[PDB]
């Protein structure tokens, strides 16, 4: 059969968690 | 694009061309309108992003003065409210009530809870506030008795049901578009291929499923009839 | 086709009074075989057991146009009083006595406990007797404002078990067809209780299928011991 | 092919009055078998059950060109008053009585409630009686401004269930073909109630297939007991 | 490349050559434009990059003076709006309104929400502004009354619909091109193989799907008819 | 290498030798020209690398003086522009307009947006600037009225459509090459095997696909006809 | 067969765990 | 066959361990 | 066949090990 109303949102949530992990390592450094 | 183009794209992807088809275009409209809100929430709820102009719709409302509760003296000040029930906005876009001119006026659309307590600031005693009550109407509130003369407003937002807000669509220059199929569907093109894919996946499996086809006072689905 | 046309075409198809070996039948046997073919064909078509069609009662326009002239609708509000049922809230309704199969069946409810849902058109669900005990307390398959359970019993009766009072009983069934009697029969003879001439009431499309089935039945009748 | 050509080709294909063993038919028998072959062939073509063609009513150009001459369009605004239906908002329309299968069926609506959409053409959906109860309330498959439910009932009627008033009822069906009668038949005789000569109204493309099937039916009729 | 080349490339890859085909070139046109928008957003929304001139497209607009709300003395200053509705733009490129010479003039094209509060700065009082209003037209506003004399402008942007902006395209030196199929499709050639692949994948499965062929007052899809 | 060698390599890899073949050499030219730009973008857009000399082409343009908008006095200074529309360059190479001698002269090819504002620097008032307008022509601009006498320039860049820029190819010593097949294809050899692989993969599947072959007023693809 | 009232909750819980892991790395830096 | 009275609790325990691992990395920083 | 008196204990022990690993990272910070 076929339906993506639950897999699409889980994939989107997985990629959102990856998004937050990626942007949580961003730092504007100091001590130049 | 219009409702007709999206509907018939879905139908032709599914090849539901015969009039003797189980899944009519009404199923397509229902699925499209729900999956639109689904996709918009999935894309514009995680983190704040630019929302294009295609996702929005303008409804036009006619306001009427109503008592707060009833006609009593001590029941509080009166409110204006839209004559008809208003669609529910999603919390992802830029909702705005404007006085028939988007580039002028300040009518603030706020939450139901906030509007309980607004205007106590002396400099904010002349600002009209809006919210959708649990009644389903858009209620207006302010401390400046001039607001009660307001007769017409237009509300621009990413409404949660495209069908409802399109039915409440504002009159065009040519005139009103009677048929919903000839109105414009509220979604950006970059979200249209995913929307069609989701709806077509939703109805592909059910399209070829068996039916309880024999009229024999019996359930015939276990036998794949 | 008319009765004269049934007879003439039937004789032509059997090659009656031809030079080759053939079969000649009386008009009474023509009536008998035509009626038997008619009833067998329409029962097979209703049940979907005919291989040539392989289709059920209303599953295509072909079968619709075949059996459209047998479906009759019936209403009744009279309840048979003295009977024994499987529930206190069980009412009995008489069947029109010409029914073969019930295809649509509905009950209207008049009870003050239905609030503003009075006269609610409730579906009559035919239930087996295995399911009845466990369906009485079912809140999704048992009697309700939107469900009535019907059980067949003796004397052509219908036991409607409902939670609310049932005032009316709407139903649509396949009716007895008028037999195909090609000649007013003598005293004593009759087909399905009919003695005079009786024309088929179905559509002309299926008359020829009836004709060929009758011809095959006649051939089997005369050639089942040879 | 004309009636004279039909008879002559029938005789030639049957090898009538040749030296070898053969079959000779009367013009009445030729007419009967030609009509039977015609109607069998077109019904098998419409249902798509012919193994030779294996195509449905309008599934290819060939079948269009075969059954093009039976497609008849019909319009009616009169409603039959006294009939018992399965819903309050049920209207009944007569059928032309020469219909074989309804292929297109649409209904125009005139009601105030659907304002500025008045005179909307509405798709008549033939619906079985199983689905009627659970389709009355269905907002996607039930009656609406763009969809009407038609149920077949007795006496060649069409019960249109609509949420709005139905003003006009349009049809395009397959008609009774005129029989193939090769001679003015004597008194009493007729094919499909027609006694005079009747030429096939279909295209000449299918006349020879009809002739072949009629010949095969003739041999079957003469050679079913030997 | 023109619309014809792309359309017929998709069709020939699908081998939809017979005129008795379920999927006509209009399906192809619709899918091509929607996947164009999809691909452009997918490529040029994550981070900022260079947009080539090929994804850009131009239209000709005729401006008419209109009231803000209606003709009244106190309803605010008038606006200039395009006579016809304007396609929605994609927020990925360099939208620009110019007075028929790209290398001259400063007519800023800003967000609709920003356009309410604009021109108060003393040095920004002679700058002409634009924004596609919820009505669908491109409204113009400025504090220097000379703007109302402006009669005709052009608008370059990466438009949401290639077809809508192609219909409103500027006249060429030779003249107008009557057929949409003879106009230049607005996408870079580096994005064309992805687009053709996506559209062909969209229509490959459906191309071989069963149809409800029999005319028998029945749904024949479960039987794979 | 020439267009002929690449085209016939693709055809022979596909074995499309019969004249009665669905996919003609025109499909091959289209796919080659698009996949060339695709590969060049994929290789020379991530990070800046040396671009060989094979990826470039020289077109020769004939310039004509044109008004900025029309013949009005106050409509600004006039511009030169190429007589015919110019191909769109990719942003990966070293675009350069030169006065028929690559090793001499300074004509700067800049972006459309930049050329609005150039030459205000007093030392840059004699530099000719170039850009492709949305009209599709190459427009020239400078503050030194001597530029308007310029009659011929040649433009060397990695053009986004090999067919267009090859059609505009500069006259050779022997003479013009009429047939495109006899001209030289613009790509480095290290990108040729990948290009052939991509095109052959693109057409391998479609090569053996079924056709709607029966002329019967019917779609015959679902039946794999 | 099929019923996803326990698969859905477990996938949602897994994504919640991964989200909490992502946001737990976020810091607002100092020493400029 | 089918029974989830042992797999459900093991999955729940796995997600509980993931929960505790995720929340054990949470820190309210100092030195601003 | 089937008997889960050793599979159950090993899965439970694995989850115990993973739980001990999780809780062993917990700290109550200092230096505010």
Give the 3-state DSSP-derived string for chain B, with helices as H, strands as E and coil as C. Answer: CEHHHHHHHHHHHHCCCCCCCCCCHHHHHHHHHHHHHHHHHHHCCCCCCCCCCCCCEEEEEEEEEECCCCCCCCCCCCEEEECCCCCCECCCCCCEEECCCCCCCCEEECCHHHHCCCCCCHHHCCCEEEEECCCCCEEEECCCHHHHHCCEEEEEECECCHHHHHHCECCCCCCCCCCHHHCECCCCHHHHHHHHHHHHHHHHHHHCCCCCCCCCCCCCCCCCC
**Subunits that touch chain F (at least 3 Cβ pairs < 8 angstroms)?**
D, E
Method for structure elucidation: cryo-EM
Q: What is the DSSP letter of D2?
A: -
Provide the CB-side half-sphere exposure for I20 (13 A, CA).
Answer: 5
DSSP 3-state of E60: strand
Q: How far apart are CA D225 and CA C85, in angstroms?
A: 56
Residue ranges of E strands in chain F: 57-66, 79-82, 96-98, 107-109, 128-132, 138-141, 152-157
Decide if I15 and H14 are in contact by the 8 Å CB cutoff.
yes
**Taking the C-alpha atoms of E175, E181, E183 and E185 in order, what is their torsion angle to the nearest 10 degrees?**
170
- DSSP, residue by residue, chain C: --HHHHHHHHHHHHTTT-SSS-----HHHHHHHHHHHHHHHHHHHHHT--TTT---TTSSHHHHHHHGGGEEEEEE---B-S---SSTTEEEEE--SSEEEEEEEEEEE--GGGTT-TT-EEEEEE--SHHHHHHHS-TTTSSBTTEEEEEEETTTEEEEE-SS-EEEEEEEEEEPPPP-B-S---TT--BTTB-S-B---S-TTTHHHHHHHHHHHHHHHHTS--
In the block, residue with structure tokens 């706020």: B110
Contact F165, F87 (CB under 8 A): yes
Report chain G's C-alpha Rg in angstroms. 16
Contact C123, C148 (CB under 8 A): yes
**Taking the C-alpha atoms of E28, E33, E35 and E36 in order, what is their torsion angle to the nearest 10 degrees?**
130
Sequence-ordered list of residues with C-beta below 8 angstroms from that of G21, at least 6 positions apart, any chain:
A21, H21, H22, H25
In the block, residue with structure tokens 């899918």: E31
Q: How many CB atoms lie within 10 A of CB C202?
A: 22
Task: Find the angle CA(B41)-CA(B44)-CA(B47) to the nearest 5 degrees.
Answer: 130
Q: How far apart are CA C44 and CA C39, in angstroms?
A: 8
Sign of the torsion angle spanned by Cα atoms G20, G22, G23, G26: positive
In the block, residue with structure tokens 């090999």: F162
Alpha carbon E142 to chain centroid, angstroms? 26
Q: How far apart are CA C209 and CA C196, in angstroms?
A: 24
Burial E143-165 (b: 16+ CB within 10 A, else e): beeebeebeebbbbbbbbbbbbb
In the block, residue with structure tokens 């325990």: H13
Alpha carbon D22 to chain centroid, angstroms? 35
B196 contacts on A by Cβ (under 8 Å) = none
Q: How far apart are CA D70 and CA D47, in angstroms?
A: 15
Element (H, E) at D218: helix D207-222
Strands D157-161 and D147-153: antiparallel
Contact C99, C175 (CB under 8 A): yes
Provide the CB-side half-sphere exposure for B85 (13 A, CA).
Answer: 8
3-state secondary structure D82-98: CCCCCCCCEEEEECCCC
User: F22-30 long-range contacts, Cβ below 8 Å, gap at least 24?
Assistant: F22/E12, F22/E15, F22/E17, F22/F207, F22/F211, F23/E12, F23/F203, F23/F206, F23/F207, F27/E9, F27/E12, F27/F203, F28/F199, F28/F203, F29/F3, F29/F163, F29/F180, F30/E1, F30/E5, F30/E9
Give the best residue of C6, C9, C13 to mutate against chain D (max D CB count within 10 A).
C13
Smallest CA-to-CA distance from H31 within G21, A30, A24 is with: A30
Instruction: For chain D, say whether F216 makes contact (Cβ under 8 Å).
Output: yes
Residues for chain C: how many in total?
226
Smallest CA-to-CA distance from D211 within D31, D20, D17 is with: D31
E16 contacts on B by Cβ (under 8 Å) = none
Q: How far apart are CA D73 and CA D71, in angstroms?
A: 7
Structure tokens at D15: 């090898």
Q: How far apart are CA F157 and CA F171, in angstroms?
A: 17
Q: How many CB atoms lie within 10 A of CB B97?
A: 22
DSSP 3-state of D199: coil
Smallest CA-to-CA distance from E56 within E188, E189, E191 is with: E188
Q: How far apart are CA D91 and CA D78, in angstroms?
A: 10
Q: How far apart are CA F198 and CA F191, in angstroms?
A: 11
Provide the CB-side half-sphere exposure for D139 (13 A, CA).
Answer: 5
**Taking the C-alpha atoms of C43, C48, C51 and C54 in order, what is their torsion angle to the nearest 10 degrees?**
140
Decide if G15 and A20 are in contact by the 8 Å CB cutoff.
no
The dihedrals phi and psi of I19, each to the nearest 5 degrees, come to -65, -45
In the block, residue with structure tokens 């809230």: C89
Q: What is the DSSP letter of F184?
A: B
Smallest CA-to-CA distance from F36 within F211, F185, F212, F223 is with: F185
Distance to chain G for H22, nearest Cα, Å? 5
Q: How many CB atoms lie within 10 A of CB B156?
A: 24
**Nearest-by-Cβ selection for E222 from B52, B189, B208:** B208
Sheet of C147-153, strands arranged across: C71-76, C166-175, C99-109, C121-126, C147-153, C157-161, C90-94
With an 8 Å CB cutoff and a minimum of 3 pairs, decide whether chains A and E touch.
no
Smallest CA-to-CA distance from F12 within F147, F225, F199, F205 is with: F199
**Subunits that touch chain D (at least 3 Cβ pairs < 8 angstroms)?**
B, C, E, F
Structure tokens at C187: 């005293």
**Subunits that touch chain B (at least 3 Cβ pairs < 8 angstroms)?**
A, C, D, E
**Nearest-by-Cβ selection for B178 from D116, D123, D126:** D116
Structure tokens at D181: 């009668």
Contact D85, D159 (CB under 8 A): yes
Q: How many CB atoms lie within 10 A of CB B207?
A: 20
Q: How many CB atoms lie within 10 A of CB A23?
A: 11
In the block, residue with structure tokens 């069947």: C95
Contact D7, D24 (CB under 8 A): no
A6 contacts on G by Cβ (under 8 Å) = 4, 8
In the block, residue with structure tokens 């709806």: B199
Provide the β-strand partners of residue F187.
none
Q: How many CB atoms lie within 10 A of CB B99?
A: 19
Size of interface D-F (CB pairs under 8 A): 11
Smallest CA-to-CA distance from C137 within C91, C71, C87 is with: C87
Instruction: For chain E, say whether D40 makes contact (Cβ under 8 Å).
Output: no
Sequence-ordered list of residues with C-beta below 8 angstroms from that of B183, at least 6 positions apart, any chain:
B2, B3, B166, B169, B177
DSSP 3-state of F132: strand
- DSSP, residue by residue, E122-151: GGGTT-EEEEE-TTSSEEEE-SSGGGGG--
DSSP 3-state of D6: helix
Sequence-ordered list of residues with C-beta below 8 angstroms from that of E7, at least 6 positions apart, any chain:
E25, E28, E29, E32, E181
Q: How far apart are CA C209 and CA D40, in angstroms?
A: 9
Structure tokens at D80: 């039959």
Instruction: For chain B, say whether D130 makes contact (Cβ under 8 Å).
Output: yes
Sign of the torsion angle spanned by Cα atoms E167, E173, E179, E180: negative
Contact E126, E118 (CB under 8 A): no
Residues for chain F: how many in total?
225
Distance to chain E for F24, nearest Cα, Å? 10
Element (H, E) at D120: strand D120-126
Residue ranges of E strands in F74-161: 79-82, 96-98, 107-109, 128-132, 138-141, 152-157
Structure tokens at C149: 């359970």
Provide the CB-side half-sphere exposure for D75 (13 A, CA).
Answer: 3
Q: How many CB atoms lie within 10 A of CB C166?
A: 23
User: G4-7 long-range contacts, Cβ below 8 Å, gap at least 24?
Assistant: G4/A6, G6/H4, G6/H8
Instruction: For chain C, say whether D5 makes contact (Cβ under 8 Å).
Output: no
Q: How far apart are CA B129 and CA B139, in angstroms?
A: 8
Burial of C168 per CB tally in 10 Å (0-12, 13-18, 19+): middle
Q: How far apart are CA E205 and CA F3, in angstroms?
A: 34
In the block, residue with structure tokens 């009513």: D57
In the block, residue with structure tokens 């993506």: A4
Provide the CB-side half-sphere exposure for E42 (13 A, CA).
Answer: 15
């Amino acid at each position: 059969f076929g339906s993506g109303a639950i897999g699409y949102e889980f994939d989107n949530r997985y990629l959102n968690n990856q998004e937050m992990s990626a942007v949580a390592k961003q730092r504007l450094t100091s001590l130049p | 694009m219009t409702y007709n183009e999206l509907i018939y794209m879905v139908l032709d992807e599914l090849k539901l061309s015969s009039d003797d088809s189980y899944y009519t275009p009404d199923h397509v409209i229902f699925l499209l309108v729900k999956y639109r809100s689904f996709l918009l929430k999935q894309r514009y709820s995680d983190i704040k992003k630019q929302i294009p102009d295609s996702d929005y719709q303008s409804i036009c409302l006619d306001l009427i003065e109503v008592p707060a509760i009833s006609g009593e003296p001590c029941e509080g000040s009166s409110y204006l409210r839209s004559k008809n029930k208003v669609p529910t906005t999603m919390m992802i876009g830029n909702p705005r009530v404007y006085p028939m001119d988007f580039y002028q006026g300040e009518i603030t659309y706020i939450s139901r809870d906030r509007m309980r307590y607004v205007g106590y600031n002396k400099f904010l005693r002349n600002i009209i506030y809006c919210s959708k009550a649990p009644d389903g109407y858009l209620y207006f509130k302010s401390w400046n008795p001039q607001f009660l003369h307001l007769e017409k407003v237009s509300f621009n937002a990413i409404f949660e049901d495209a069908k409802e807000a399109s039915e409440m669509a504002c009159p065009e220059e040519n005139g009103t578009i009677c048929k919903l199929e000839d109105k414009e569907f509220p979604i950006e093109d970059a979200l249209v291929p995913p929307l069609i894919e989701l709806v077509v996946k939703e109805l592909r499996g059910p399209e070829y499923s068996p039916k309880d086809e024999d009229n024999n006072a019996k359930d015939d689905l276990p036998d794949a009839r | 086709m008319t009765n004269k046309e049934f007879s003439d075409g039937f004789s032509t198809l059997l090659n009656s009074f031809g030079i080759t070996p053939n079969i000649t039948l009386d008009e009474y046997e023509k009536s008998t075989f035509l009626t038997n073919a008619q009833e067998q064909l329409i029962i097979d078509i209703y049940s979907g057991r005919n291989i040539i069609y392989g289709k059920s009662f209303e599953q295509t326009e072909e079968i619709r146009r075949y059996l459209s002239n047998l479906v009759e609708t019936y209403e009744t509000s009279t309840k048979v009083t003295g009977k024994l049922g499987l529930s206190k809230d069980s009412v009995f309704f008489e069947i029109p006595q010409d029914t073969w199969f019930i295809t649509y069946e509905v009950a209207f409810l008049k009870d003050s406990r239905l609030g503003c849902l009075d006269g609610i058109e409730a579906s009559v669900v035919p239930l087996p007797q295995d399911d009845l005990y466990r369906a009485k307390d079912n809140p999704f398959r048992g009697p309700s404002k939107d469900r009535v359970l019907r059980l067949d019993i003796k004397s052509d009766l219908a036991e409607l078990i409902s939670k609310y009072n049932v005032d009316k009983y709407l139903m649509r069934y396949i009716s007895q067809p008028t037999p195909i009697i090609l000649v007013d029969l003598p005293d004593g003879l009759s087909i399905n209780g009919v003695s005079t001439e009786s024309e088929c009431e179905l559509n002309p499309v299926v008359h020829r299928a009836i004709l060929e089935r009758a011809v095959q039945l006649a051939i089997i009748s005369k050639t089942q011991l040879t």
